[PDB]
Design a protein around this ligand. Structure first.
Ligand SMILES: Cc1cc2nc3c(=O)[nH]c(=O)nc-3n(C[C@H](O)[C@H](O)[C@H](O)COP(=O)(O)O)c2cc1C
Ligand SMILES: [Mg+2]
Length: 169
């Protein structure tokens, strides 16, 4: 199995499109993509480095497929693993709940032993509140393909460089 397991959910495809950009950005072929509508909870056991991708749905909720997997995470042993988070979200439509989902996921996985890496500055986003907030920073990369599509490629470039360091790749 490849070094990095990237587990994403999507309804309208934008999280999946970002996921593929992230995979490519690593340059070297070190990522396997998993759609969580199709994946099993035990697939996470296969990787030391995890990337978790999730948009926020229904105003502050986990994406439906990630909702399903989340209820199965209380058993999984994340101890010693390193975990990064990315989300797509809409900071103009949902200013009070922007990227809530990666914060919900990170709260759960960090409690199970998985160490968060790849925190991301909140600079250049216009939002009011977020469960992904971690003191000046989001728990992971915030993408917005609704409002800031023109910023996605450069944000991914910069974030992947950071993760490569954290994963020692
Ligand atoms: C009804 C609905 C509610 C949403 N609520 C939020 C929200 O609470 N926070 C947020 O950041 N984005 C919210 N969004 C925007 C989506 O998260 C954003 O469009 C995301 O890219 C969709 O991902 P997908 O195309 O992979 O399904 C909402 C979108 C819809 C249609
Ligand atoms: Mg405990």
């Amino acid at each position: 199995a490849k070094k990095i397991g990237l587990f994403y959910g999507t309804q309208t495809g934008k999280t999946e499109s970002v996921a593929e950009i992230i995979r490519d950005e690593f340059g070297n072929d070190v990522v396997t993509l998993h759609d969580v509508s199709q994946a099993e909870v035990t697939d996470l056991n296969d990787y030391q480095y995890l990337i978790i991708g999730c948009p926020t749905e229904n105003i502050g909720e986990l994406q439906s497929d990630w909702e399903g997997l989340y209820s199965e995470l209380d058993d999984v042993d994340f101890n010693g693993k390193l975990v990064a988070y990315f989300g797509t979200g809409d900071q103009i439509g949902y200013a009070d709940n922007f990227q809530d989902a990666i914060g919900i996921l990170e709260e759960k996985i960090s409690q199970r032993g998985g160490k968060t890496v790849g925190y991301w500055s909140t600079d250049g986003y216009d939002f009011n509140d977020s469960k992904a907030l971690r003191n000046g920073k989001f728990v992971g990369l915030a993408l917005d393909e609704d409002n800031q599509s023109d910023l996605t490629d450069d944000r991914i470039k910069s974030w992947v460089a950071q993760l490569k360091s954290e994963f020692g790749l």
